[PDB]
């Protein structure tokens, strides 16, 4: 059968299938070539993906995310009892382990962290096989290179839940590598820079790639630093605006300021392919439109200080692995915020003009290197 590449990622995850010598990265119901990781449950029915995240702003507390910050850990866990005070949802404790705990039609039900991830790669299994016409069980799965056993054994059992057989946990930034080919270069070792900046997180990696032997150097970065900071800084930006135009603070209007989020987040990814973008949004508030704009300068400017700061976590990881910048043969981006041209930028200006590995869309790259992995494990490479 058709063996899969699945990355579960923290705030989206995306699918991908080796076949006739190229990669597909396989788009969902609404064409989108990558899935929320949100999980919702309703007085009738439980939604995954898309339709997870577009109805959070009416149903806060039932609507689960962040799932992969829970998995493999302890309710008691300084990590978790720090997060806890962010998510609307409830975390509960069953003898020691976390469980999500919500309304679902009509019941209190708990949910331990692989259980909800298992919906999300279900939800993945699914779209692989309306794409491919086949039953698909085989899968790769990727986690961070940071993971222990326990976290790596969750995800694991995340897949059997969902029916997939797991033929191997493997991770990110690895499987980062593996779809450039850095492990397939005529020549001795490589070292292999891995800037990660996604939705949530933001991890840098260093490989010292030889004989097949993905050796981790380092690892640096911020789990609380992605694109969510930067929508954040504009949300933010708009809401003081609104206040300046229209008298009215639209702070505690949960569906407003989500749906002002949603408009954000849109510029933001225009932002990286133009010089500007519309904010259109219909009766925001009190029925009273918000149509306007943001050029790219002031997006960059919002967030001067968190794209400059990713500089440092590259600085900590290079010392770490006792190598200089010239001592790079490979830089990749992975993630979708490193579409970002002011990120792309600095790290270029960072490592002194270097060329970075880009041409896979770095939302998808891990998701590729799955793919490829998937295909080599069930004898299809
Ligand atoms: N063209 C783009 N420009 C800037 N940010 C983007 C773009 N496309 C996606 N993003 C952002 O990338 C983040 C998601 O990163 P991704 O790697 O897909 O998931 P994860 O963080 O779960 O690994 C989100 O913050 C999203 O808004
Ligand atoms: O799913 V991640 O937050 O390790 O890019
Ligand atoms: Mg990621
Ligand atoms: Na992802
Ligand atoms: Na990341």
């Given at each position: 059968?058709?063996?899969?590449?699945?990355?579960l990622?923290?705030?989206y995850?995306?699918?991908?299938?080796?076949?006739?010598?190229?990669?597909?990265?396989?788009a969902?119901?609404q064409?989108?070539?990558?899935?929320?990781?949100?999980?919702?449950?309703?007085?009738?029915e439980?939604?995954?993906?898309?339709?997870?995240?577009?109805?959070?702003?009416?149903?806060?507390?039932?609507?689960?995310?962040?799932?992969?910050?829970?998995?493999?850990?302890?309710?008691?866990?300084?990590?978790?009892?720090?997060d806890?005070?962010?998510?609307?949802f409830?975390?509960?404790?069953?003898?020691?382990?976390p469980?999500?705990?919500?309304?679902?039609?009509?019941?209190?039900?708990?949910?331990?962290?692989?259980?909800?991830?298992?919906?999300?790669?279900?939800?993945?299994?699914?779209?692989?096989?309306?794409?491919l016409?086949?039953?698909?069980?085989?899968?790769?799965?990727?986690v961070?290179?940071?993971?222990?056993?326990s976290?790596?054994?969750?995800?694991?059992?995340?897949?059997?839940?969902?029916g997939?057989?797991?033929?191997?946990?493997?991770?990110?930034?690895?499987?980062?590598?593996?779809?450039?080919?850095?492990?397939?270069?005529?020549?001795?070792?490589?070292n292999?820079?891995?800037?990660?900046?996604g939705?949530?997180?933001?991890?840098?990696?260093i490989?010292?790639?030889?004989?097949?032997?993905?050796?981790?150097?380092?690892?640096?970065?911020?789990?609380?630093?992605?694109?969510?900071?930067?929508?954040?800084?504009?949300?933010?930006?708009?809401?003081?605006?609104?206040?300046?135009k229209?008298?009215?603070?639209?702070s505690?209007?949960?569906?407003?300021?989500?749906?002002?989020?949603?408009?954000?987040?849109?510029?933001?990814?225009?932002?990286?392919s133009?010089?500007?973008?519309?904010?259109?949004?219909?009766?925001?508030?009190?029925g009273?439109?918000?149509?306007?704009?943001?050029?790219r300068?002031?997006?960059?400017?919002?967030?001067?200080?968190?794209?400059?700061?990713?500089?440092?976590?590259?600085?900590?990881?290079?010392?770490?692995?006792?190598?200089?910048?010239?001592?790079?043969?490979?830089?990749?981006?992975?993630?979708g915020?490193?579409?970002?041209?002011?990120?792309?930028?600095?790290?270029?200006?960072?490592?002194?003009?270097?060329?970075?590995?880009?041409?896979?869309?770095?939302?998808?790259?891990?998701?590729?290197?799955?793919?490829?992995q998937?295909?080599?494990?069930?004898?299809?490479?």
């Amino acid at each position: 059968g058709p063996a899969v590449g699945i990355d579960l990622g923290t705030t989206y995850s995306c699918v991908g299938v080796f076949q006739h010598g190229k990669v597909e990265i396989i788009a969902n119901d609404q064409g989108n070539r990558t899935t929320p990781s949100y999980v919702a449950f309703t007085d009738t029915e439980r939604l995954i993906g898309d339709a997870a995240k577009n109805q959070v702003a009416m149903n806060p507390t039932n609507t689960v995310f962040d799932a992969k910050r829970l998995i493999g850990r302890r309710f008691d866990d300084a990590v978790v009892q720090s997060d806890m005070k962010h998510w609307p949802f409830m975390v509960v404790n069953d003898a020691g382990r976390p469980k999500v705990q919500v309304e679902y039609k009509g019941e209190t039900k708990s949910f331990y962290p692989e259980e909800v991830s298992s919906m999300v790669l279900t939800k993945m299994k699914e779209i692989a096989e309306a794409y491919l016409g086949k039953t698909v069980t085989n899968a790769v799965v990727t986690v961070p290179a940071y993971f222990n056993d326990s976290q790596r054994q969750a995800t694991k059992d995340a897949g059997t839940i969902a029916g997939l057989n797991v033929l191997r946990i493997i991770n990110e930034p690895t499987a980062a590598a593996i779809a450039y080919g850095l492990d397939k270069k005529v020549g001795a070792e490589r070292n292999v820079l891995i800037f990660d900046l996604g939705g949530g997180t933001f991890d840098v990696s260093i490989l010292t790639i030889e004989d097949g032997i993905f050796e981790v150097k380092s690892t640096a970065g911020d789990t609380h630093l992605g694109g969510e900071d930067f929508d954040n800084r504009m949300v933010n930006h708009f809401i003081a605006e609104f206040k300046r135009k229209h008298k009215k603070d639209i702070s505690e209007n949960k569906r407003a300021v989500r749906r002002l989020r949603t408009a954000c987040e849109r510029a933001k990814r225009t932002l990286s392919s133009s010089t500007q973008a519309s904010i259109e949004i219909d009766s925001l508030y009190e029925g009273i439109d918000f149509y306007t704009s943001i050029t790219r300068a002031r997006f960059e400017e919002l967030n001067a200080d968190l794209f400059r700061g990713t500089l440092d976590p590259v600085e900590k990881a290079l010392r770490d692995a006792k190598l200089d910048k010239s001592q790079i043969h490979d830089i990749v981006l992975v993630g979708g915020s490193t579409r970002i041209p002011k990120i792309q930028k600095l790290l270029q200006d960072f490592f002194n003009g270097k060329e970075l590995n880009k041409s896979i869309n770095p939302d998808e790259a891990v998701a590729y290197g799955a793919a490829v992995q998937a295909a080599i494990l069930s004898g299809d490479k």
